[PDB]
């Protein structure tokens, strides 16, 4: 039916209108104070007033930190940009890691622009170029102008073109009898397809046949666009989208990450501010999530202390599972959660507590009904006892081998014997480690 | 074809109740691991869940990769099976996370439904209109069958495919409209005046009868990585073969995920997940493990199968020793299959099957002595001795391997243990760890 | 005979559903309660608008990248459309840097140093280094000894464009590799040859996996021309920038000449073919669909984007095959217009609310659109299904044959609790 992967039984924080966390709501069991703190953080992000606010989710393994991150993402909605990231992703062989971090920082910022578009469209009726006086003169083109006649519903318009537009028109491979669509903002032409006013069944080029477009040939339409600031920076650093030669050859070169300068980002900020001041654009700040932040070294942390102090920085959520560990890139500095103390002073730490037997049992209950499986009560008690004895995750994954072993005996219900058979067939970390210690040749 | 290490394994050897036979499909013994692998096989065949980590652990020469090829052979066609080693991730143009992302996306198959039209008949007239420089091409094709006749219109790709493998007004061609393929089936007109610049001896086929144009539904499976590489830049289809896919941006991947879900919503496509098999998984850095721990939690995640032959040893990138060479976070979200050593009857059955695969006839006493030396030494040595003993017996001009042939093969070619023994009495002849060697014999 | 039909939400419908859920800041319980009771009515109006069809909340339009441009726009027997796209970012440069660093004048030595470095002290000059040129011509096989001076002082793209495969003499040190020998044989070779098929892996992989009928999945978000550099008070800067941005040789190379202009140049003017400017050097796209970043709205996505409309499209085929007369009920008129244009796309015989006896007398009309005596109806359909019995009872009252009602419902929304 549908596919599930270690999540998707979580639909939100499950708070009230007063911010009080109910015990079993939103797919969440327990973690009440952490859910309330994350709800206050969600309201702070919705307030749209602060920049560079950082929190850290600190706890042990299998305690609900990534679940809280996706819960915050689902509470904020699809409008707010959310950028998930693992700490190993910053090490690029193309560009330095500082630029990758700043690229993600700009990617966690949204922008909603209402843009107007000038559109010429219709079915091509005539296509007649006029020649130049001296074609082999070295300077100048072979043609001077091209006359294109477009017709539509209640309209017929005759267009005189420069050579630069007609190069794009012929790059789209138009013909007489074609419905085209010309963008006046960038000179782009889209060839929609053949018109249905002629015969259809006499082609061999798998084409699609469109009716005559409605309205006048010349139009002005309003389009709502959703971009990020990284898109503006990338589109300006490697220019495409013009009909000039440098943008024309920028599409053919192999793309590569470059070090975007501060001057380009300042100019992009100036253009976005001028858009906002005219009542056209709207700024939607978002969240950057860095899971496994202990994989960062001291240089990325030291750049984080400078990148957090900008006046455009997003809200960055960090996660760790470290006790009193040495920071990577150092030899003697030992810090809580693997994060240096110059950054910890700028964070707000949120604790995340372990579970009890009843919480483990009901987590197995929701994971069973989301995976579309039916479990007996005694098998559920045995699974909860395994989850306390070995791990919650091991009891969570053993559900689907139990379902396969139940289906292979022409049955639907999961019984205790299936759980014992899945105990025997599949092992956990502790049993495998005990086999490893008592072994002949490094098993 | 040629004979490889696992050429004798075609399947997993299981019943309808997922119970292993003692000898089936080239696999002997290892009952519990084969039953667990059959459970993983049914888990893949259901296609319901995503991102499960399976670890296969045991001593060397036990049947780890044998189990992996059994799963791959029982998986069937059109389901992806990506097999990588631990050392292929380290690249000079790709980061480790990018290489692992591409290895994850190679294991998810997208099966696309496509409506095509087929045209077969006799060519009556070809008119081709070209420009003076030869760039713009257009024309008409006049094709006929017994009952029908239709003048078509051609474009540049059709004239390019018509000029290649030249058709000459009386040949019978078959046109695929969606794949754009022109296939010449033969010639039926038998034209009298042939200006023979060529040595064509084309087949005499009949003129086809019936409908000229016929619809057909086709299916083809493509991978998620291939769609990403095609959509990344202008010439990405070349980069599917040259490997010039340098760090595909994340925006391409989000748009491809949304479009694949959209194609599922119209019934045009469907998602067929597969198995990614990472052999020698201890040869991965700690950053790769930290990436895998969160890459297993995505909607588009395959079933990851890992094989390890190592004990409590040092994790790469760190300074501590962990079980199986893997950190405890990765071991938390994995289910472990344990594989055990062999008896002597299993070794004998393995050697008999490997002799039958190489088409080499063995005597009884040769089989017992090969079994004894595969018990005392390793099994792979006694499997390697079979072809050498066959060539020795073929030197004497008889097609059966005796005890003398395998005895000569044991004398000529050495084991590991005899090599350690011979090196340790003659340490002066070989170069030591400190660079000292005596080369003079006196 | 009451039949209820359930359909799951689509991806876009779930997207605006989650947007509407996150907009009002987690008060869904009161929303559902006072939606079931029937300000908040304007809040739930958007919810039923999304649940009906996603085009009521936001109409789908042409999908194109954002144009980061300032161009010549209109503020409203032919018309002129001239290319005028620019970049909003301006880089301002003083005149002094240009006139004293890039342009030659009497007080600077740009052209003197250029001549000294590029002509006089060039080591491929045959006027001073004839022996090196003769050595290189024995090495390479070039028939001219001035080829190396020409190659070393021209740009790379110009060298790609005017490169001609001229003949070279045999008595030289240059060779033919076996890879090049394999390449040259299969240039025009037909199918079913062994060498030709062993050298054509990529085209066979293209034609086997049906790659000329695949759809484009990614388009860029922002498209932006190069950054415009302005210098106030200088025509030379404008001419230099226009020459660099619109170089006629490379612009002709990435395009082609029209066929009638080639006929006029070859025949009416006597220009030989070898004297034509080199054209047609742009790479071919993968498909027709991969040639541009603009995607038009299609009338196949319009059906699938609404689960109710998709289920009704599947349900209408069986009633068309069984030849009934179907009544469709609504609550608004925007959905009435949307279903009217959908039916005209499908070309079904339908009438829209002197029409009553026209409906009874003519059996050719299939779908009647009504808004909350028609005895000729056989099947009545509730699109916007509401369980008020006062409206439902009279709707079944205005409807000898078997009468079946249909209700289109969406799983996991307000209507499922309704």
């Amino acid at each position: 039916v549908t596919r599930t992967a270690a999540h998707t039984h979580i639909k939100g924080l499950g708070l009230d209108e007063s911010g009080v966390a109910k015990r079993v709501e939103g797919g969440f069991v327990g973690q009440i104070e952490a859910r309330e703190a994350c709800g206050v953080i969600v309201d702070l992000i919705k307030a749209k007033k602060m920049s560079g606010r950082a929190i850290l989710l600190a706890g042990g393994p299998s305690t609900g930190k990534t679940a809280l991150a996706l819960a915050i993402s689902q509470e904020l909605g699809p409008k707010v940009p959310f950028c998930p990231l693992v700490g190993s992703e910053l090490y690029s062989v193309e560009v330095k890691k500082t630029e990758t971090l700043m690229e993600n920082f700009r990617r966690a910022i949204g922008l909603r622009i209402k843009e107007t578009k000038e559109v010429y469209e219709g079915e091509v009726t005539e296509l007649t170029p006029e020649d130049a006086e001296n074609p082999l003169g070295g300077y100048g083109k072979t043609i001077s102008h091209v006359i294109v006649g477009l017709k539509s519903a209640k309209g017929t318009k005759t267009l005189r073109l420069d050579p630069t537009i007609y190069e794009s028109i012929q790059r789209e491979k138009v013909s007489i009898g074609d419905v085209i669509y010309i963008e006046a903002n960038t000179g782009a032409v889209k060839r929609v397809g053949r018109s249905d006013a002629y015969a259809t069944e006499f082609d061999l080029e798998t084409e699609e046949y469109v009716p005559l477009p409605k309205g006048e040939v010349h139009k002005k339409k309003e389009i709502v666009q959703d971009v990020t600031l990284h898109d503006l920076d990338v589109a300006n650093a490697r220019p495409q989208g013009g009909q000039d030669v440098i943008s024309m050859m920028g599409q053919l070169l192999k793309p590569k990450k470059t070090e975007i300068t501060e001057k380009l980002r300042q100019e992009v900020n100036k253009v976005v501010a001028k858009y906002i001041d005219q009542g056209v654009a709207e700024l939607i700040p978002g969240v950057l999530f860095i899971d496994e932040v202990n994989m960062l070294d001291i240089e990325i942390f030291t750049y984080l202390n400078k990148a957090l102090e900008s006046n455009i920085a997003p809200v960055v959520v960090l996660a760790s599972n470290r006790g009193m560990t040495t920071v990577r890139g150092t030899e003697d500095v030992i810090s809580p959660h693997g994060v240096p103390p110059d950054l910890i002073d700028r964070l707000l730490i949120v604790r995340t507590l372990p579970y009890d037997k009843d919480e483990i049992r009901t987590i197995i209950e929701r994971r069973a009904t989301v995976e579309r499986l039916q479990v007996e009560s005694s098998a559920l008690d045995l699974l909860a006892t395994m989850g306390t004895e070995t791990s919650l995750r091991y009891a969570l994954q053993l559900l689907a081998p139990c379902g396969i072993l139940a289906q292979t005996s022409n049955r639907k219900e999961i019984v205790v014997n299936d759980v014992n058979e899945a105990k025997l067939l599949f092992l956990d970390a502790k049993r495998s480690t005990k086999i490893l210690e008592t072994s002949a040749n490094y098993l | 074809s040629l004979i490889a290490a696992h050429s004798h394994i075609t399947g997993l050897g299981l019943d309808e109740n997922l119970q292993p036979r003692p000898t089936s499909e080239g696999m002997v013994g290892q009952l519990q691991a084969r039953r667990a692998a059959g459970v993983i096989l049914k888990m893949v065949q259901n296609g319901t869940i995503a991102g499960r980590a399976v670890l296969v652990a045991g001593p060397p020469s036990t049947g780890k990769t044998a189990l992996a090829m059994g799963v791959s052979q029982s998986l069937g066609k059109d389901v992806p099976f990506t097999a990588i080693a631990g050392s292929e991730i380290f690249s000079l143009e790709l980061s480790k996370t990018e290489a692992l992302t591409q290895a994850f996306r190679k294991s998810i198959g997208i099966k696309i439904k496509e409506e095509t039209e087929l045209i077969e008949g006799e060519v009556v007239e070809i008119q081709i209109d070209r420009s003076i420089t030869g760039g713009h091409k257009q024309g008409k094709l006049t094709i006929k069958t017994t009952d029908m006749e239709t003048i078509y219109e051609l474009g540049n790709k059709m004239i390019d495919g018509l000029t290649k493998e030249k058709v000459l007004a009386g040949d019978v061609i078959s046109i695929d409209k969606a794949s754009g393929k022109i296939t010449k089936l033969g010639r039926s007109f038998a034209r009298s005046r042939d200006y023979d610049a060529m040595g064509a001896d084309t087949r005499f086929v009949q003129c086809p009868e019936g409908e000229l144009q016929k619809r057909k539904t086709v299916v083809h499976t493509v991978s998620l990585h291939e769609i990403d590489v095609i959509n990344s830049r202008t010439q990405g289809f070349l980069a599917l073969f040259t490997g010039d896919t340098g760090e595909i941006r994340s925006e391409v991947r989000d748009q491809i995920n949304t479009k694949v879900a959209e194609w599922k919503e119209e019934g045009k496509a469907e998602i067929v997940p597969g198995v990614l098999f990472i052999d020698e998984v201890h040869m991965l850095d700690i950053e790769c493990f930290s990436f895998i721990n969160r890459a297993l939690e995505d909607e588009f995640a395959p079933i990851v199968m890992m094989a390890t032959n190592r004990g409590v040893s040092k994790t790469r990138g760190t300074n501590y020793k962990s079980p199986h060479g893997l950190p405890l976070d990765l071991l938390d979200r994995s289910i472990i299959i344990t594989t055990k050593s062999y008896n002597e009857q299993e070794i004998k059955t393995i050697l008999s099957i490997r002799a039958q695969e190489e088409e080499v006839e063995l005597s009884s006493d040769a089989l017992d002595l090969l079994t004894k030396t595969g018990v005392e030494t390793s099994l792979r040595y006694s499997s390697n001795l079979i072809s050498v003993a066959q060539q020795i017996a073929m030197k004497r001009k008889n097609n059966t391997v005796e005890v003398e042939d395998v005895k000569r093969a044991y004398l000529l070619f050495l084991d590991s243990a005899r090599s350690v023994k011979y090196v340790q009495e003659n340490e002066s002849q070989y170069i030591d760890d400190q660079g000292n060697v005596q080369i003079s014999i006196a | 005979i009451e039949i209820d039909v359930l359909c799951d939400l689509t991806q876009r419908q779930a997207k605006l559903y989650q947007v509407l859920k996150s907009q009002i800041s987690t008060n869904y319980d009161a929303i559902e309660n006072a939606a079931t009771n029937d300000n908040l009515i304007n809040a739930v109006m958007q919810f039923r608008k999304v649940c009906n069809h996603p085009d009521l909340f936001e109409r789908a339009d042409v999908d194109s990248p954002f144009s980061f441009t300032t161009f010549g726009k209109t503020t409203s027997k032919f018309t002129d459309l001239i290319y005028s796209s620019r970049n909003p970012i301006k880089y301002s440069l003083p005149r002094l840097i240009y006139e004293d660093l890039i342009l030659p004048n009497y007080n600077n030595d740009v052209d003197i140093a250029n001549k000294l470095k590029n002509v006089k002290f060039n080591i491929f000059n045959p006027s001073t280094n004839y022996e090196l040129c003769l050595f290189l011509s024995k090495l390479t096989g070039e028939p001219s000894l001035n080829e190396f001076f020409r190659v070393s002082t021209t740009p790379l793209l110009k060298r790609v464009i005017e490169r001609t495969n001229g003949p070279k003499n045999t008595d030289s040190l240059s060779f033919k590799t076996i890879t090049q020998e394999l390449l040259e044989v299969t240039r025009n070779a037909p199918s079913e040859g062994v060498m030709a098929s062993l050298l054509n892996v990529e085209k066979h992989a293209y034609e086997r996996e049906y790659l000329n009928c695949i759809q484009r999945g990614y388009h860029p978000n922002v498209s932006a021309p190069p950054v415009t550099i302005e210098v106030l008070g200088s025509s030379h800067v404008t001419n230099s920038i226009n020459n660099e941005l619109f170089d006629p040789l490379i612009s002709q190379a990435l395009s082609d000449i029209p066929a009638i202009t080639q006929y006029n140049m070859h025949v009416k003017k006597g220009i030989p073919v070898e004297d034509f400017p080199k054209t047609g050097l742009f790479p071919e796209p993968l498909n027709k669909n991969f040639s541009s970043n603009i995607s038009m709205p299609s009338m196949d996505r319009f059906i699938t984007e609404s689960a109710k409309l998709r289920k009704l499209d599947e349900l209408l085929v069986k009633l068309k095959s069984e030849g009934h007369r179907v009544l469709i009920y609504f609550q608004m008129t925007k959905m009435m217009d949307l279903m009217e244009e959908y039916l005209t796309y499908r070309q079904y015989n339908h009438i829209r609310l002197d029409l009553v006896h026209d409906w009874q007398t003519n059996p050719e009309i299939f779908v009647f659109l009504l808004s909350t005596n028609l005895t000729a109806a056989d099947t009545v359909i509730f699109y916007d299904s509401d369980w008020n019995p006062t409206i439902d009872s009279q709707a079944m009252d205005r409807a000898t044959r078997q009468v079946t009602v249909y209700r289109l419902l969406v799983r996991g929304t307000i209507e499922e609790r309704m």
């Binding site: 053949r194 002629y198 259809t200 | 007239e125 070809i126 070209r130 219109e153 007004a169 009386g170 | -």
Partner: peptide
């Protein structure tokens, strides 16, 4: 009724004709 076929325009272009008995090649 039957829709008209699309107009065909080949002006200033060479032609290659291939028939049963004879092949032509019209050049400029």
């Amino acid at each position: 009724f039957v829709k008209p076929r699309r107009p065909y325009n080949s002006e200033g272009m060479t032609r290659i004709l291939r028939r049963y008995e004879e092949d032509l090649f019209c050049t400029f």
